[PDB]
Amino acid sequence: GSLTEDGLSYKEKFVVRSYEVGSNKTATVETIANLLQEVGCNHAQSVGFSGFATTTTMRKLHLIWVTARMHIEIYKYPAWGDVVEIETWCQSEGRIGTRRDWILKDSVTGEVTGRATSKWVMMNQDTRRLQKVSDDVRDEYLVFCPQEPRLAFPEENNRSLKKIPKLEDPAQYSMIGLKPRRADLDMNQHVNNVTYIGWVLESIPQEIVDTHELQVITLDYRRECQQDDVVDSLTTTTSDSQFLHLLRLSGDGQEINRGTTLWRKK
Amino acid sequence: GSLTEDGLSYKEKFVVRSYEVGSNKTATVETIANLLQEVGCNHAQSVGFSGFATTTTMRKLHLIWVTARMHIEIYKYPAWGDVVEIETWCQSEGRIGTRRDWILKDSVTGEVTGRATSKWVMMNQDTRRLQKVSDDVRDEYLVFCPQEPRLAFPEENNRSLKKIPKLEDPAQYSMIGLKPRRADLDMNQHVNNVTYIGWVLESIPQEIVDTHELQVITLDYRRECQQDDVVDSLTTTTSNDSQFLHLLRLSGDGQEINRGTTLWRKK
Numbered sequence A: 001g002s003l004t005e006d007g008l009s010y011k012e013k014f015v016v017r018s019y020e021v022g023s024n025k026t027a028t029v030e031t032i033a034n035l036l037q038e039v040g041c042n043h044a045q046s047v048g049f050s051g052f053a054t055t056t057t058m059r060k061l062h063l064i065w066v067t068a069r070m071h072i073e074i075y076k077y078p079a080w081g082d083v084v085e086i087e088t089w090c091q092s093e094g095r096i097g098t099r100r101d102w103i104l105k106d107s108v109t110g111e112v113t114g115r116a117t118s119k120w121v122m123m124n125q126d127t128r129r130l131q132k133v134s135d136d137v138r139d140e141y142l143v144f145c146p147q148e149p150r151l152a153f154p155e156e157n158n159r160s161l162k163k164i165p166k167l168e169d170p171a172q173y174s175m176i177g178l179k180p181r182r183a184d185l186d187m188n189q190h191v192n193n194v195t196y197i198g199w200v201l202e203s204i205p206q207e208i209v210d211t212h213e214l215q216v217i218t219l220d221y222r223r224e225c226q227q228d229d230v231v232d233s234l235t236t237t238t239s240d241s242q243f244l245h246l247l248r249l250s251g252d253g254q255e256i257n258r259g260t261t262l263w264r265k266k
Numbered sequence B: 001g002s003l004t005e006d007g008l009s010y011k012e013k014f015v016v017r018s019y020e021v022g023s024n025k026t027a028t029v030e031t032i033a034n035l036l037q038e039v040g041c042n043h044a045q046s047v048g049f050s051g052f053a054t055t056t057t058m059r060k061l062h063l064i065w066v067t068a069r070m071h072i073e074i075y076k077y078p079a080w081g082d083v084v085e086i087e088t089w090c091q092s093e094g095r096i097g098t099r100r101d102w103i104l105k106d107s108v109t110g111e112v113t114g115r116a117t118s119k120w121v122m123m124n125q126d127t128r129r130l131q132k133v134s135d136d137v138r139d140e141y142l143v144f145c146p147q148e149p150r151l152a153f154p155e156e157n158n159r160s161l162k163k164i165p166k167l168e169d170p171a172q173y174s175m176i177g178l179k180p181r182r183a184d185l186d187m188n189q190h191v192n193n194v195t196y197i198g199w200v201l202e203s204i205p206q207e208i209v210d211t212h213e214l215q216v217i218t219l220d221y222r223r224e225c226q227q228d229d230v231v232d233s234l235t236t237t238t239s240n241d242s243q244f245l246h247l248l249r250l251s252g253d254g255q256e257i258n259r260g261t262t263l264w265r266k267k
Ligand SMILES: CCNc1ccc(C)nn1
Pocket: A043, A044, A047, A053, A065, A090, A098, A099, A100, A120, A141, A144, A145
């Protein structure tokens, strides 16, 4: 793994492991979202950030970078034993926060097999208070970003920026009583962003998973699920097959996530 | 990853990933059990077997290798970003089945940071009926094994071969209503052997996990948990060091699926 010649992006190769693949012997979408997370952490580490991408100002201010949205689009899931090359870079989005992008490539053919974009915001780690990002914070990471815009999804009016609606009760399909275990936590004891993807997908009928492959997934993150919390995953078909998703806490019905998935017939 | 000079063992290096570590920034025991599984799968692939290590006779006969026991003992959990080198080899145990062993090593110092041994049995995949290993099946994989004994736990009185008792109700601690999700299944849609390790450990109090580190884990596998099954994880302390007794059973009928023990030392 290394930063590119200009130092404004990072690349890494991954050999697909036996436990990382699904019933069709290709990496699951959760293995992909994990690999994006891993190359993201390695790009931050290689540029000085020893908290993910927490600058010197943020560590003292008790501020952290938090995912607001993740959008992944896959064309070909890499096979077990294959090598996948991922390129990642960060970009400032003014006071809103940062945008981290990815390009997934086949290491033998060089063809793009997928792409991802994520939108991150800054919050206080002691309270969920969303912040508008200071000008002094910006200048600390802006030196590690390209200045000319470089977007993984440059298409004006594409899937990555579309507003997601709330799932109306009753749902078509559901997977109730989901609790995270220790393997679902990160090194800071918080639930891993990838687990929520798995939970959304748990309500999809097995018949869709068996006859279709996941093409697009957009996940809006609203609130975090704590260790002792229980979750309900809801799904309704809105149509290729398209779905509407809602993650909420089993008890009060408090929203934690919302999203959509797009699937193609195998 | 490659077979050694003699072709009777396999080695592979792994860089510890950010999502693979625990609160102490070192690989979890579940990341370790997964890495053992991965190097096991790669040693079988590099020698012809590509079902895990299914011979051409096991394939026609609908026979598979299933884990009966796993024993892992760790001295140092590798840090996030560190490189761990694992060496694996398989050995025949007559008609009982095979034994697959591992040596975990630090890639910078060469020191052994852990070791593991697993005992595998032959089973008919359709009827779930166990059976002794035939001569014809044996001759197919014996060529890939060392003939002189090579044991990861060679000791005369070792923890890897001790009989585990059943946990008597009521348990001291428990973690009720555990269901596997799709990320818990392998490529054949069966529950992954590593998930059961996570389920045993879910009943351990957080105060043990925070003040102690896992040293030894022995897991006996008796029955598999199906996709739609729900599991109960039970724990009772049996003891400077903390020792526990574990029992995994199906929430419904109380059917046993796993039993084991864990050994923890104060950080
Ligand atoms: C290049 C390292 N800097 C950053 C800042 C924020 C985010 C989300 N990612 N990366």
